[PDB]
Amino acid sequence: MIRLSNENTIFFMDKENVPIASCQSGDTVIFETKDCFSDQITNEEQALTSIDFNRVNPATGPLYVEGARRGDMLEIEILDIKVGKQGVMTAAPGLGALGESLNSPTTKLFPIEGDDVVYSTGLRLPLQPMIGVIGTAPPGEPINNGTPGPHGGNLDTKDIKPGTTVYLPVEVDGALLALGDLHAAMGDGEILICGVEIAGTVTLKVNVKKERMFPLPALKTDTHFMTIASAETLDAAAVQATKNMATFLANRTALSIEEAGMLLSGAGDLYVSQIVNPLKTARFSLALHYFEKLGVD
């Protein structure tokens, strides 16, 4: 019902951004988004370097969630993501995990045809819509949308998709939730620099939780719970994400930290979100089955 337009967009997660809309806890809110190029790239002979880089990574927002105060967390249920008709990718030498291996700058447009993302005649990828950039305002200095952090931001986590609940911190009153950078498809790592970048519309439900039960950001799918951390190195983000899960498990259950460690090492999985942003992002994942067996919800 409450609908946030793609003209109402920000480039930094900033506590001083004026809210574009407000909602109550439990309200459903629709966010319309531009692609991460602010829809500047519309043909395949248009180079990445041709656009205004001041307008990359627009996030729709911020939303003021009434009842949210410093120390709370948002529980955000992703009910649906609808994408547009065509996505974009850019390959640029010197960018991304293959930067030194790429030879020429390439722009590719991807028709969305049903639930297929058309790479070429013979290659069609599954339509797997996700949110790349989702976040609340940090309490101190503004952080550009292109950088991830404890507040969220540029997480590029493929599990931030329909049916997932995302958990973010409330560090300023009202939270100031903003999102953008939808993808039609993207693998773990986002190794080129980008997913199939695309505009769309996200429907979410936003709940205010008055107790912050675990380290943030975090998310829950139909089957698994995941702690997320970002750092300068993948080495450091992986360790932090893992420690986030173990200390949570230890704190909230009859398990000792050593027992929690054994559980994670035997039954949990460390995953890579993206290795290409100014901070790298990893998530540690444990089946909800185990949390229920340890009496945790």
Binding segment (CB under 8 A) for a second copy, from list 15-23, 25-33, 69-77, 288-296 = 288-296
Applying CB under 8 A, which of residues 30, 51, 102, 213 lies at the interface with a second copy? Answer: 102
Of 220 and 283, the one with the shorter C-beta distance to a second copy is 283
Q: Which residue is nearest to Ca ion (CB)?
A: 132
> Residue count at the site for a second copy (CB under 8 A)?
60
Residue 239 binding result from Ca ion, a second copy, none, given CB thresholds of 5 to 8 Å by partner type: a second copy
Applying CB under 8 A, which of residues 5, 28, 50, 265 lies at the interface with a second copy? Answer: 265
Applying CB under 5 A, which of residues 38, 128, 154, 242 lies at the interface with Ca ion? Answer: 154
Residues 246-275 that bind Ca ion (CB under 5 A): 250
**91 touching a second copy, by CB under 8 A:** yes
**132 touching Ca ion, by CB under 5 A:** yes
Report the 3 state secondary structure along the chain.
CEEECCCCEECEECCCCCCCEEEECCEEEEEEECCCCCCCCCCCCCCHHHCCHHHCCCEEEEEEEECCCCCCEEEEEEEEEEECCEEEEEECCCCCCCCCCCCCCEEEEEEEECCEEEEECCEEEECCCEEEEEECCCCCCCEECCCCECCEEECCCCCCCCCCEEEEECCCCCEEEEEEEEECCCCCECCCCCCCEECEEEEEEEEEECCCCCCCCEEECCCEEEEEEEECCHHHHHHHHHHHHHHHHHHHCCCCHHHHHHHHHHHCEEEEEECCCCCEEEEEEEEHHHHHHCCCC
Of 176 and 229, the one with the shorter C-beta distance to a second copy is 229
Residue 183 assigned ligand-binding role: yes
Of 18 and 47, the one with the shorter C-beta distance to Ca ion is 47
Q: Which residues bind a second copy (CB under 8 A)?
A: 89, 91, 96-98, 101-104, 106, 108, 117, 119, 122-123, 125, 185-196, 233-235, 238-239, 242-243, 246-247, 256-259, 261-272, 275, 280, 282, 284, 290, 293-294
